[PDB]
Amino acid sequence: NQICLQKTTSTILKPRLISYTLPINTREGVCITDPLLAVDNGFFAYSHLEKIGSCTRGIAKQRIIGVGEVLDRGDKVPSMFMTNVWTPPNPSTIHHCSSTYHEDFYYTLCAVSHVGDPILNSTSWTESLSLIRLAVRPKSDSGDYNQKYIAITKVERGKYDKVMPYGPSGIKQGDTLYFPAVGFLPRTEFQYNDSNCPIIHCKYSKAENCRLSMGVNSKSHYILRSGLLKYNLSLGGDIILQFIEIADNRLTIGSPSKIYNSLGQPVFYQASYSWDTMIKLGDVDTVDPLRVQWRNNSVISRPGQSQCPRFNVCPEVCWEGTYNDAFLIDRLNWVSAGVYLNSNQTAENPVFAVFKDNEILYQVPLAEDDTNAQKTITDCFLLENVIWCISLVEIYDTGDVIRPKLFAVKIPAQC
Amino acid sequence: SYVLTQPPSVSVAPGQTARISCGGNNIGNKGVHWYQQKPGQAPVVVVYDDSDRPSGIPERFSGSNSGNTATLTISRVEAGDEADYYCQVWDSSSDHVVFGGGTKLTVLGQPKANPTVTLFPPSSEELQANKATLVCLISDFYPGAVTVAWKADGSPVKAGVETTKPSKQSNNKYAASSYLSLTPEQWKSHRSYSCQVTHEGSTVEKTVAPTE
Amino acid sequence: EVQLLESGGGLIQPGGSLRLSCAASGFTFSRFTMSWVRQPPGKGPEWVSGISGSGGHTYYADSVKGRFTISRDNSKNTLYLQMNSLKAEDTAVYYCAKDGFVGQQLMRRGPWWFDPWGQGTLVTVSSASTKGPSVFPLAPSSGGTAALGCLVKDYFPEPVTVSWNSGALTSGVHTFPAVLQSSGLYSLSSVVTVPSSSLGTQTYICNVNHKPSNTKVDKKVEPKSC
Ligand SMILES: *[C@@H]1O[C@H](CO)[C@@H](O)[C@H](O)[C@H]1NC(C)=O
Ligand SMILES: *[C@@H]1O[C@H](CO)[C@@H](O)[C@H](O)[C@H]1NC(C)=O
Ligand SMILES: *[C@@H]1O[C@H](CO)[C@@H](O)[C@H](O)[C@H]1NC(C)=O
Ligand SMILES: *[C@@H]1O[C@H](CO)[C@@H](O)[C@H](O)[C@H]1NC(C)=O
Ligand SMILES: [Cl-]
Ligand SMILES: [Zn+2]
């Protein structure tokens, strides 16, 4: 665990394209969307949605959930080699999948909906959850070992009407799985004190802005609160799903999140989907109840719109932003690696960066200044004894399929 | 700072289908919007986010964006569609809203009509006030666009020229005027002055001489 | 329906200051980003400045930064533009413009577009003071017709009015729209096409009236003697 700890404008990062080993075929009017990436213990999980036509309004063609091994492909660069792919029969009904690795399998928790994205149709969505277990090293003659699908029926939600997985990847603790999740709570039941919304140095802010922006709109029936979905494998019997709400310290609207293992401890990231646009990440103080020691990070934010653009800090009623997580690679110096979008109000210009709380040590663009890019997911790991990070980046091809790309970036030990 | 480039003029006949261009470097990396501006009115959005159509806008107005050029094609074009069309994007390298120069869409409800040109030299009263103004009057041309070039003898002059925008006359044809402002010494220093009006590829020329 | 009503335009010398207002109705004013878009005469529109619904963020074009201020009173549903140290190139029609997007999206392909626009308010930055015209004759000497006229030169502001023989002559009269010169003064000509037969038997006088300066000039247009 040696990395360069000195800032430099030199380009010491050499990103490698590693999408060659994944089944992301390119065609005329095929769009690949809703991606997922997880990397754990030399294995990985991946998913996307193949659409025909519009990337946002198009018809669903195929959803894939696949796992496999991350291996040195032959030139000391890691790459993802799929071993086990599952395909659901109705690809338009599967939403918000989240993968967690545990003892030889990847557990992907998905939402089932026939009304579209539950976030954008909260009241019409009838809560329906399921789980698909994929073995990272398949066996012949094994029955349900390679693939197992289970519908979830025992759900403990607490005070929330509905719960749902909400993020790319989760973490295991012993034999209990934890998934990034969100609880739908009606506004009427939401306990929040206006005096707590920090407008002190915000001349144009109003006390009500925090409470209003906990839903996708001010008059939304529900507010969204992020949290965890808990599944204890040692219990057995009929599976029980348990929602754990996140603590109210630095509370923002429920947004896609990630809880992950780094150097032996759980770390959390939450997408900034409203007015608090500085990156939200940090070590988990307690898993249950869920409390995060958010970093006071002053250098990384996310693109928004005109009401809460990049670097906005003062409370407004806005539902804007992108998911751009970061991965802690050094807890002693609290250094992280991730891709951010270098644009104030549009999703473009992706830049892979290694940074502390108040300083970007080094970084490198992943495309041209103008290239469109939305979601990015970064997971880091050891390959032999070398530190690598793998970054999934949604990228738009001006010429052509608009699809995710995969980059491997080696983190230098020296400067 | 980002630059949007549009063709200055586009012509069709009534009910013909027209195509207007908005060019920018890698303009597929940006969301393009289109506005229509009829004379004497404020602009009106007809396309937003490359291809989306605002409610209240006829379906014949369609937008698309690819590579280095966005296109606003209008089918079943009509005399009401004669307006200026502007494309517009957001430049995230400058945090600026950028407009194109505009495209005059002309649909011709009239056969081509060449302008009548009359050239007036400076009068003696104005000359006695130590001033000199050449008056070139352009009338009865359709469609309503001309280009005026002045010449001192056979040599071009481009300073001291002011030309008006065309205005529609009461007979639905157009009129314009151009003024060449000269000092008395540069009026007398040449043998002849000419105003050349070019309308639809053809040029009409009128000449005046300082020596009466 | 959504209405945007601009006011405050007028005439001002370079280096002066004007304040524009825009009255908004038909929508919740504080939830939308508002902008000023200007159009110089004979050119396309140019984005000047914008402001978020709360006013927490203000945005300016480089050509305008440091001189103009965008602000907004949400209790009055009013958008403002304080233009200071005005230059001649600021002369234009200034529009109120409302962000046209409504809905819930996390990101927008085009985060700034306008629907609708106001009808605009005109701003003229000019050094021109009120001046009466100098009226010069355009002597006649094309078929069987002659062209004679009057040159109404270096006047400000518009309009002027031209008649021939105290309104007795209306046929064949063509009064051309004025040109705006470097100086900021206007010039126009009016020409009558007459039979050359009538040059020796009918008199032609143009009547030029410029009410702003209370100027009335009558000019007899006679054939020159070469
Ligand atoms: C949202 O749910 C409603 C059910 O009342 C229905 O219109 C449809 O399933 C959904 N609409 C959209 C636009 O997704
Ligand atoms: C999971 O269940 C077992 C009982 O089989 C219990 O001993 C253990 O503490 C539980 N773990 C969690 C995290 O709840
Ligand atoms: C961030 O700052 C707050 C307020 O000073 C503090 O309570 C919190 O512990 C800080 N977080 C870290 C990780 O230092
Ligand atoms: C983005 O916003 C910051 C302030 O939040 C500003 O300093 C920067 O210039 C903006 N970027 C662009 C390209 O205008
Ligand atoms: Cl509204
Ligand atoms: Zn000369």
Cβ of B99 within 8 Å of Cβ of C111? The answer is no
What b/e sequence results for C114-152 when a residue is b if at least 16 CB atoms lie within 10 Å of its CB, and e otherwise? Answer: bbbbbebbebbbbebeebbbbbbbbbbeeeeebbbbbbb
Minimal CA separation from B99 to chain C, in Å: 7
Whether A120 has its CB under 8 Å from any CB of chain C: the answer is yes
**CA–CA distance, A3 with A334 (Å, rounded to integer):** 12
Cβ of A204 within 8 Å of Cβ of C55? The answer is yes
Elucidated via: X-ray
List of chain A residues whose C-beta atoms are within 8 Å of the C-beta of residue B95: 344-345
Cβ of C113 within 8 Å of Cβ of B48? The answer is yes
Q: Where would I find the beta strands (DSSP E) of A77-128?
A: 78-86, 94-102, 105-112
Burial of B151 (0-12, 13-18, 19+ CB in 10 A): middle
Mutate to test the pocket of ligand 3, among A296, A298, A331, A332 (most ligand atoms within 8 A of CB): A296
List of chain A residues whose C-beta atoms are within 8 Å of the C-beta of residue B29: 348, 370-372, 396, 398
Q: Beta strands C58-60 and C215-220: pairing type?
A: unpaired
| Cα A383 to chain centroid, rounded | 23
Residue A377 pairs with which residues in a beta bridge? A392
Instruction: Name all chains with 3 or more CB-CB pairs below 8 Å to chain A.
Output: B, C
Task: Point out the ligand nearest to the CA of residue B92.
Answer: 4
Whether B145 has its CB under 8 Å from any CB of chain C: the answer is no
Q: How many residues does chain B have?
A: 212
For atom 9 of ligand 1, the residue with the nearest CA is A115
**CA–CA distance, A327 with A335 (Å, rounded to integer):** 9
Task: Point out the ligand nearest to the CA of residue B192.
Answer: 6
**CA–CA distance, A107 with A97 (Å, rounded to integer):** 10
Give span(s): CATH 2.60.40.10, chain C.
Answer: 3-125, 134-221
CATH number of C3-125: 2.60.40.10
**Can you tell me whether residue A22 is helix, strand or coil?**
coil
**In contact, C133 and C152? CB cutoff 8 Å:** yes
Cβ of C112 within 8 Å of Cβ of A306? The answer is yes
List of chain C residues whose C-beta atoms are within 8 Å of the C-beta of residue A303: 107
The DSSP output letter for A208 is T
**Can you tell me whether residue A194 is helix, strand or coil?**
helix
**In contact, A141 and A157? CB cutoff 8 Å:** no
Chain B (124-183) residues lying within 8 Å, Cβ to Cβ, of chain A? none
**Can you tell me whether residue B186 is helix, strand or coil?**
helix
Minimal CA separation from B91 to chain C, in Å: 10
Which pair of structure tokens corresponds to residue A39?
């990397």
Q: What angle do CA B149, B177, C225 make, to 5 degrees?
A: 95
Residue A155 pairs with which residues in a beta bridge? A241
Whether B29 has its CB under 8 Å from any CB of chain C: the answer is no
What b/e sequence results for A32-43 when a residue is b if at least 16 CB atoms lie within 10 Å of its CB, and e otherwise? Answer: bbbbbbbbbeeb
Helices and strands, number each (H, E), in chain B:
2, 18
Strands of the sheet containing C161-164, edge to edge, are: C161-164, C205-210, C215-220
Return the closest-CA partner of residue A46 out of A66, A32, A61, A68.
A66
Minimal CA separation from B100 to chain A, in Å: 19
Q: Pick from C50, C106, C109: which is nearest to A306 by CB?
A: C50
Which residue matches tokens 């690598």? A388
Distance A148 CA to ligand 2 centre (A): 23
Ligand 2 first shell, C-beta below 6 A: A 176, 232, 234-235
Q: Pick from A120, A204, A303: which is nearest to C54 by CB?
A: A204
Distance B186 CA to ligand 6 centre (A): 6
**In contact, A228 and A178? CB cutoff 8 Å:** yes
Which pair of structure tokens corresponds to residue A15?
């990103």
**CA–CA distance, A42 with A382 (Å, rounded to integer):** 8
**Element at B120 (helix H, strand E):** strand B116-120
List of chain B residues whose C-beta atoms are within 8 Å of the C-beta of residue A349: 92
**CA–CA distance, B21 with B7 (Å, rounded to integer):** 7
Cβ of A369 within 8 Å of Cβ of B93? The answer is yes
Which residue matches tokens 């969307």? A33
**What percent of the residues of chain C are helix, what percent strand, and what percent coil, each to the nearest 5?**
5, 50, 45
> Please, what are the domains in chain A?
15-410 (2.120.10.10)
**What percent of the residues of chain A are helix, what percent strand, and what percent coil, each to the nearest 5?**
5, 50, 50
Minimal CA separation from C8 to chain A, in Å: 25
**In contact, C78 and C21? CB cutoff 8 Å:** yes
For atom 1 of ligand 3, the residue with the nearest CA is A296
Q: What angle do CA C93, C94, C99 make, to 5 degrees?
A: 135
Which pair of structure tokens corresponds to residue A94?
């599967």
- Identify the sign of the CA torsion A90, A66, A177, A166: negative
Q: Pick from A345, A371, A398: which is nearest to B90 by CB?
A: A345
> Please, what are the domains in chain B?
4-107 (2.60.40.10), 116-208 (2.60.40.10)
**In contact, C179 and B138? CB cutoff 8 Å:** no
Maximum distance among all alpha carbons in chain B?
Answer: 65
The CATH architecture one would assign to domain C134-221 is Sandwich (2.60)
A185-189, long-range: CB within 8 Å, 24+ apart, which pairs? A185/A159, A185/A160, A185/A161, A185/A222, A185/A223, A185/A224, A185/A225, A186/A161, A186/A221, A186/A222, A186/A223, A187/A215, A187/A220, A187/A221, A187/A222, A187/A223, A189/A159
**CA–CA distance, A281 with A278 (Å, rounded to integer):** 10
